[PDB]
Symmetry: C3
Subunit: 388 residues, 3 copies
């Protein structure tokens, strides 16, 4: 609305590092444009899934293909208030692209906020814009930054964020919450009403974006967000599924990042939470069989606390019988579940559209995260205002 941000994309950029800020910022009322040198709006970029399993370094597999909404060659920097540089393997080649270094230098020269994460900083080193600047980055980027005159800050923990003037840097996607918050503040944003506790009902193979994006978006606002899964405790990990449309009549599926739970399902007081969020994917169909899970849903629905479910997440609500006389959307196929549950179907067209029915916010698929998070924020009374 009152702010416009540009995201510098590239092939094999880290999937979370482009999508989380892309949708979170939009959810907060910021217009976001994505560009990649040599590509135009509508074109796609493959992404990389960099997971920290158990090797001496991260493992890589392919993530969701990312569709650009802007044309690099037609970029007018005077129209942008901030720049975001995702990590992944795109930075190393983007850093050697003349037009890219030029763009970053021009932006850095203006004093406008630049949020760079993980390997994204390689581009700042190439643009020679870190001399004497305090900054962190993925640990392996340290040598290059030091060589470029930076006041390097070794990331002691994966969530470390550093700030120098309007230059905001992070080491990994685990720092997204503070990373994004600092960027929003840098853009003159003021966050209010974020003192809330949110519970996420997770499970094996929930959709990769659908758990991470809303989870980190809410944490970025300052909310306390917990993730639980039956039979699993804090620290345990849940594998995720990347659902993407690649030309066939339905989506394809491949592994996403493993997601770490934060709270024990057993020791869980639902009355201690202000809202419930249900990621989509394949976890909902089996979680819907867990009576304890259904009880939690019924409680929030009865207490009339905000409940946000997306895509297949609605399968749990239907099983809980809390959809009778309620209006909501869901993944197209899930219409069966909604209608069978006694609910009123709302057509998810466009696919990124979300709906609010009293305390219930529903989305259809990951493209709808901006409205999903935005509408949940409205119900929780959380606001981001650009008045500073």
């Amino acid at each position: 609305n009152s702010r416009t941000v540009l995201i510098l994309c590239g092939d094999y950029m880290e999937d979370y590092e482009v999508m989380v800020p892309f949708q979170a910022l939009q959810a907060f009322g910021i217009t976001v444009h994505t560009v990649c040198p040599g590509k135009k709006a509508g074109d796609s970029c493959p992404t990389a899934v960099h997971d920290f399993c158990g090797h001496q370094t991260y493992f890589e597999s392919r993530g969701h293909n990312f569709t650009l909404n802007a044309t690099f060659d037609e970029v007018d920097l005077s129209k942008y208030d901030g720049l975001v540089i995702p990590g992944g393997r795109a930075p190393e080649y983007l850093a050697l692209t003349a037009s890219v270094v030029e763009l970053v230098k021009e932006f850095s020269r203006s004093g406008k906020p630049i949020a760079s994460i993980c390997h994204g900083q390689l581009i700042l080193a190439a643009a020679d814009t870190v001399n004497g600047r305090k900054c962190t980055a993925y640990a392996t980027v340290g040598p290059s930054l030091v060589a470029a005159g930076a006041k390097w800050v070794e990331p002691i923990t994966p969530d470390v964020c550093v700030v120098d003037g309007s230059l905001i840097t992070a080491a990994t996607y685990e720092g997204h919450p503070e990373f994004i918050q600092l960027f929003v503040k840098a853009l003159g944003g003021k966050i209010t009403g974020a003192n809330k506790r949110i519970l996420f009902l997770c499970g094996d193979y929930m959709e990769d974006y659908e758990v991470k994006v809303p989870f980190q978006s809410l944490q970025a606002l300052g909310c306390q967000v917990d993730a639980v899964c039956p039979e699993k405790k804090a620290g345990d990990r849940c594998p995720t599924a990347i659902h993407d449309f690649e030309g066939d009549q339905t989506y394809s599926e491949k592994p996403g990042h493993t997601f770490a739970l934060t709270t024990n399902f057993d020791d869980l007081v639902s009355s201690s939470y202000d809202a419930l969020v249900i990621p989509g994917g394949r976890a909902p169909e089996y979680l819907a069989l867990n009576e304890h899970v259904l009880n939690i849903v019924k409680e929030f629905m009865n207490s009339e606390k905000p409940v946000a479910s997306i895509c297949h997440g609605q399968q749990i609500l239907a099983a809980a019988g809390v959809l009778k006389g309620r209006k909501c959307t869901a993944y197209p196929a899930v219409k069966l579940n909604v209608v069978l549950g006694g609910g009123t179907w709302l057509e998810p067209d466009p696919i990124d559209r979300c709906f609010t029915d009293g305390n219930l916010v529903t989305g259809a698929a990951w493209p709808g995260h901006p409205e999903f998070v935005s509408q949940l924020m409205a119900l929780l009374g959380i606001q981001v205002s650009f008045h500073h």
Copy 2:
């Protein structure tokens, strides 16, 4: 002949759930047509491999591409005696396809047999054809079926099957045997001579379809079928290979479903078995080096008991020396092993054809399962009559 069945296919339907019934029913003498809305005969559908690693739910990877043989838009329900609905991720979107719902609704009201498995039942719930009907399905489909008025039967075991009038249902592909048997009976079929015991020589990376289809087709008839692998015991698993042609000069390979052995190889006694079956893939080349395996083959051959080998499986027969002066086919490349083994080659043209030379049934690749199984049935005196 005598019976014609329609299989409601879709993108990412479970690979075993479409291929096992497609080939088993054909082996039994039933004409089977496969269709997918929006696609025509000759088009292909990607399939999903759903394996249960004891995790909270299944893991998915891609299976063989499946080639449809009929056109959805040209379908005339009056021609079909029965309908089969595979599971996987196709059902959820097919259930929201108007043309599909209409087809299922009409078929249901016609009273003809419908065999739906795992997630396939979602389409039945969408077509509102299960009210008051007893049925099972993959556990997670229970809520939808209950909401649709079904008399839900919780699947207590992976192989649980239910038959209630014209409706036959199963929970997972592990229930294929009884699932298909019940469907055949519903079509008015009578299976005779199936009281036989068959041995499968398995190994790591045998072809995904080549072990599962023949194995479950024979179980569907009512045969007791055992699977063994040297150095492994009952309960142990063997990874499998999915071989598909995707444009290059030879086939590609990716992971298939893990296959569970049922018997200990060391306690095995050939005299107890009526027939021997050898799946193809990459297991045969190393199994052919095991003298115990070669000894087993020699015993069956000398007893003149039925021996059915497909695709690369013939490498074991060649090494055993039992192809000397015998006629057979195999995977095209395996002609080398056959001829060097002293055998006479029979060209597999078309590729889905099989041959029998006395007690020896041979096939060339997975498309040949229908004739592979039907010819083994002939040697065993097993028949399906309508």
Copy 3:
């Protein structure tokens, strides 16, 4: 020139089995041409990665696409001194290709050296060229070779090699060193000065080709080569990455073969080695943060011992501060690290070109292995000559 060799390729041939000899032989001064029936120079063949991961047989995934540099239908056998037959799944179908069988029969008849490995021998059986010939092969090929009249040598271990006159055979890529050495000898080649010890700085996700090709090429010469990785001991393995360009703005990545370390990093005495090699991939970026790794590099540089680094390997050199005032190339993107490191950039054009600056040999990507190994051989004083 001096010697020219033809490599019989096919779809899904084993990646190591085609690339190692292709690049090692070139490093040794041999002109190598690669062909596949039905394909022309410039066309590519998919390759297979066959890994032995504890199953009763090997596991397979897809490797790098291999680009042929010759046209099968235009092959003039009189121009070739030797023939190499890679293994994998290509041999089974190549063996049923009439044109291929005709080619092999004629070459075998000429009496020229033929080096066949693993499953490649299936083609020899089909060509009926093993009767009375002593040979080994992947164990599963034994029955067919015996049936074909071969004097079969069951491989007691994966590295077993056999030579019977003009026929050189191996069972798996683990036998590449002796396999290639024997073939070079068969071509009338002589190796001198190979009594050297080489140390490889390995790590998780290092590039599959960049570790295996130089490692086995050096072993083929007769060198004692060891590989180490921090926190790992001999016998432990490192997963590798296969980097290939498939149409996007940067390379793709998928799993390669797992690579076995041969010595304990923690008990290492680098001073006992004559040269150091640094494979590329994603290992260098994290290895560059290990002071122990940096110390090994500094030791070799200070002693002015031969150091060969390729592609991203140079990230370690930059972090060790040993590129100040030195001339070198690296993976294009790594130019950033090199320049920031204080070095003089040498453009990698063509991409298979390598450069030598005193004791430092640098390459930019796996296509440069021939010059990479050849220039390291020069610093080490290792020569390969043909009568």
